[PDB]
Design a protein around this nucleic acid. Structure first.
Length: 52
DNA sequence: GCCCTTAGCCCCTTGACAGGCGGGAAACATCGTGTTAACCTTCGATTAAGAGTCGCTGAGTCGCGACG
Protein backbone atom coordinates (compact mmCIF):
# COMPACT_ATOMS: atom_id res chain seq x y z
CA UNK A 1 0.00 0.00 0.00
CA UNK A 2 2.93 2.36 0.60
CA UNK A 3 4.10 1.82 -2.98
CA UNK A 4 0.60 2.53 -4.28
CA UNK A 5 0.41 5.73 -2.22
CA UNK A 6 3.82 6.79 -3.54
CA UNK A 7 2.68 6.12 -7.12
CA UNK A 8 -0.50 8.14 -6.56
CA UNK A 9 1.50 11.02 -5.08
CA UNK A 10 3.92 10.94 -8.02
CA UNK A 11 1.02 10.94 -10.49
CA UNK A 12 -0.77 13.83 -8.78
CA UNK A 13 2.36 15.78 -7.74
CA UNK A 14 5.42 14.49 -9.63
CA UNK A 15 7.70 17.35 -8.61
CA UNK A 16 7.09 17.02 -4.88
CA UNK A 17 8.97 14.13 -3.24
CA UNK A 18 6.47 11.49 -2.09
CA UNK A 19 6.47 10.56 1.59
CA UNK A 20 4.99 7.63 3.49
CA UNK A 21 2.38 9.64 5.39
CA UNK A 22 2.30 12.48 2.85
CA UNK A 23 1.15 10.19 0.03
CA UNK A 24 -1.50 8.57 2.24
CA UNK A 25 -2.74 12.02 3.26
CA UNK A 26 -2.89 13.18 -0.37
CA UNK A 27 -5.16 10.33 -1.47
CA UNK A 28 -7.37 10.80 1.60
CA UNK A 29 -7.72 14.55 1.01
CA UNK A 30 -8.43 13.87 -2.68
CA UNK A 31 -11.09 11.17 -2.30
CA UNK A 32 -11.57 10.24 1.37
CA UNK A 33 -12.02 13.92 2.32
CA UNK A 34 -15.47 15.48 2.02
CA UNK A 35 -13.95 18.98 2.10
CA UNK A 36 -12.37 18.62 -1.36
CA UNK A 37 -14.18 15.64 -2.94
CA UNK A 38 -17.61 17.18 -2.35
CA UNK A 39 -19.80 14.84 -4.38
CA UNK A 40 -23.37 16.12 -4.27
CA UNK A 41 -26.28 13.98 -3.13
CA UNK A 42 -27.45 13.76 -6.75
CA UNK A 43 -24.13 12.10 -7.56
CA UNK A 44 -24.55 9.53 -4.79
CA UNK A 45 -28.13 8.75 -5.81
CA UNK A 46 -27.09 8.44 -9.46
CA UNK A 47 -24.32 6.04 -8.44
CA UNK A 48 -26.76 4.01 -6.34
CA UNK A 49 -29.09 3.78 -9.34
CA UNK A 50 -26.37 2.89 -11.87
CA UNK A 51 -24.55 0.35 -9.68
CA UNK A 52 -26.70 -0.99 -6.85
C1' DG B 1 -2.04 125.92 -67.10
C1' DC B 2 1.88 125.82 -63.67
C1' DC B 3 3.95 126.98 -59.17
C1' DC B 4 3.45 127.98 -54.24
C1' DT B 5 1.35 127.07 -49.74
C1' DT B 6 -0.93 124.35 -46.37
C1' DA B 7 -3.47 120.02 -44.67
C1' DG B 8 -3.75 114.97 -44.06
C1' DC B 9 -1.51 110.35 -43.89
C1' DC B 10 2.48 107.58 -43.00
C1' DC B 11 6.39 106.88 -40.55
C1' DC B 12 9.81 107.38 -36.57
C1' DT B 13 11.15 107.98 -31.14
C1' DT B 14 9.90 107.18 -26.07
C1' DG B 15 7.55 105.06 -22.85
C1' DA B 16 4.60 103.57 -18.62
C1' DC B 17 3.11 99.99 -17.88
C1' DA B 18 1.38 93.96 -17.23
C1' DG B 19 2.35 89.95 -16.68
C1' DG B 20 4.59 86.20 -17.66
C1' DC B 21 8.11 81.79 -18.36
C1' DG B 22 11.17 80.52 -15.04
C1' DG B 23 14.96 79.56 -11.39
C1' DG B 24 15.38 80.27 -6.44
C1' DA B 25 13.98 80.09 -1.85
C1' DA B 26 11.07 77.98 1.00
C1' DA B 27 7.04 75.24 3.15
C1' DC B 28 5.22 70.64 2.52
C1' DA B 29 3.72 65.83 0.59
C1' DT B 30 6.73 61.40 -1.28
C1' DC B 31 9.96 56.92 -1.42
C1' DG B 32 13.51 54.13 -0.39
C1' DT B 33 15.38 52.36 3.49
C1' DG B 34 15.58 50.53 7.99
C1' DT B 35 13.64 48.32 12.97
C1' DT B 36 10.33 44.78 16.74
C1' DA B 37 12.17 40.25 18.55
C1' DA B 38 6.88 36.09 23.71
C1' DC B 39 3.14 30.53 19.86
C1' DC B 40 1.92 27.07 13.75
C1' DT B 41 9.06 25.67 9.86
C1' DT B 42 4.86 22.18 2.69
C1' DC B 43 -0.05 26.96 0.12
C1' DG B 44 -2.80 25.10 -3.67
C1' DA B 45 -6.23 23.66 -9.16
C1' DT B 46 -7.77 21.35 -12.69
C1' DT B 47 -7.95 19.67 -17.00
C1' DA B 48 -10.05 15.16 -17.73
C1' DA B 49 -17.52 13.96 -22.41
C1' DG B 50 -14.41 15.83 -30.80
C1' DA B 51 -10.21 15.69 -33.79
C1' DG B 52 -5.88 15.06 -37.80
C1' DT B 53 -0.86 14.51 -36.83
C1' DC B 54 4.98 16.20 -35.27
C1' DG B 55 9.15 14.93 -31.24
C1' DC B 56 11.29 11.50 -28.07
C1' DT B 57 11.57 7.10 -24.62
C1' DG B 58 11.62 1.87 -23.12
C1' DA B 59 9.91 -3.61 -23.25
C1' DG B 60 10.07 -8.63 -25.62
C1' DT B 61 11.32 -11.20 -29.58
C1' DC B 62 15.25 -12.81 -32.85
C1' DG B 63 20.97 -13.66 -34.84
C1' DC B 64 26.70 -14.90 -33.89
C1' DG B 65 29.37 -18.05 -31.33
C1' DA B 66 32.07 -20.89 -27.22
C1' DC B 67 32.63 -23.89 -23.76
C1' DG B 68 31.14 -28.92 -22.05
Amino acid sequence: REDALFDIYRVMRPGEPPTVEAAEAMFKSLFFDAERYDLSSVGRVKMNMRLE
